[PDB]
Design a protein around this ligand. Structure first.
Ligand SMILES: [Cl-]
Ligand SMILES: [Cl-]
Ligand SMILES: [Cl-]
Lengths: 240, 232
């Protein structure tokens, strides 16, 4: 008879598709990170995985077509579907975060803030694995400075390989991607990184299974955003 | 006109995340932008399907109907359901749906090798009890082998252990049941509950016979539908 609307349900939209693998990984983490006795106790989620959004690095570094209009469209799709909170499992796309937040009715939670908060306070010197555009536009720079953090970026030659790893994953070869990425991780560690931000939502997929062999904590930006979204969801009177 | 696929999910949420992964894995794409457009409803509050069917619990239908329309209104032109048990309501939804719907049952039977006549079935009690696969298998010339009652209780227990979050526990329960089916002559085993592939993951090669993944079967069928238009 009576159905509770998704808005009243505190439904969370995921504005994804950058890329699709990263979005599927976030969904997987919403299940893992939420305490639930059964199906019915899991978080209500609506997902946009609509990958036609233009490449973020091409736009930012090369003046390629901007993703922004697509972001706005699918954000509105989610809102109309009942999302009361929106999360974007793409670091690079947070270039547009403030712009989107201007047009959003829903609450929006930054992957950047969530990720930084999940770094141990004691880690002062922190590696950053991210797309070229995320580094170039300094998305993490401002915030890291506020927390008194020193980011260690790979050198130009290394970053080229990190970028290659990211796109090999986006292209669907994890094994190859790993072969590319692992040495760069060791380089950052060799350079004194006390932790490494996985600052591209493809990186956790590449690292998965090898973390136990990595000599410092990896901070997972996707997981960080999920945890932050769960906390939002669970702060409601009908949630707790 | 983008041929967007809606996923009416959330039963349960792990099976839905699993379907998304397979969409990525099963679609040839040179880059993000060549992957399938997907809108996903994972809104798990849908009432337990088995409890309704077997135990007289609340009916999931009006929920399914609601999220169906939600997906259509977001622009999904084709809808898929990564729950076998939910297909008790498939025809009903299909009758209210403007978007195209693709049945997990047909897709899954279609992916069984022709040479496999005697096929094991791992599924929920409601899926077995309501005979979702039986009339369809019969028409194809298939003979379904299901676990004996004691074994089925353990299968059901494995499924709910996975939904509850322990994969390791679920495996300990499920694995012997798979071995039992093989001992009884199964030429292939349908994983007929969408949590099964998740439990079986990593042990597949350790299993003698082929396992037919209902989730994967649905994704492939959806991809085919997507790639079937003049502009795609
Ligand atoms: Cl990213
Ligand atoms: Cl790509
Ligand atoms: Cl199922």
């Amino acid at each position: 008879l009576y159905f509770q609307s998704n808005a009243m349900k505190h439904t969370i939209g995921i504005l994804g598709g950058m890329g699709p693998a990263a979005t599927a990984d976030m969904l997987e983490k919403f299940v893992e990170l939420r305490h639930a006795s059964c199906d019915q106790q899991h978080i209500p989620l609506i997902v946009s995985s609509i990958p036609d959004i233009p490449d973020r690095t091409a736009c930012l570094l090369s003046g390629g077509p901007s993703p922004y209009r697509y972001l706005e469209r699918y954000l509105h799709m989610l809102e109309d579907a009942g999302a009361e909170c929106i999360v974007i499992p793409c670091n690079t796309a947070h270039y547009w975060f403030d712009d989107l937040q201007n047009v959003a009715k829903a609450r929006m939670i930054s992957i950047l803030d969530a990720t930084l908060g999940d770094i141990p306070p004691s880690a002062r010197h922190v590696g950053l694995l991210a797309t070229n555009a995320t580094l170039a536009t300094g998305l993490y720079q401002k915030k890291a400075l506020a927390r008194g953090l020193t980011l260690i970026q790979p050198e130009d030659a290394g970053q080229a390989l990190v970028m290659q790893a990211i796109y090999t994953l986006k292209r669907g070869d994890k094994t190859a991607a790993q072969a590319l990425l692992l040495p760069q991780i060791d380089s950052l560690i060799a350079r004194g990184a006390q932790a490494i931000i996985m600052g591209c939502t493809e990186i956790p997929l590449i690292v998965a299974g090898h973390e136990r062999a990595i000599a410092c904590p990896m901070i997972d930006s996707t997981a960080s955003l999920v945890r932050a979204a769960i906390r939002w969801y669970e702060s409601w009177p009908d949630t707790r």
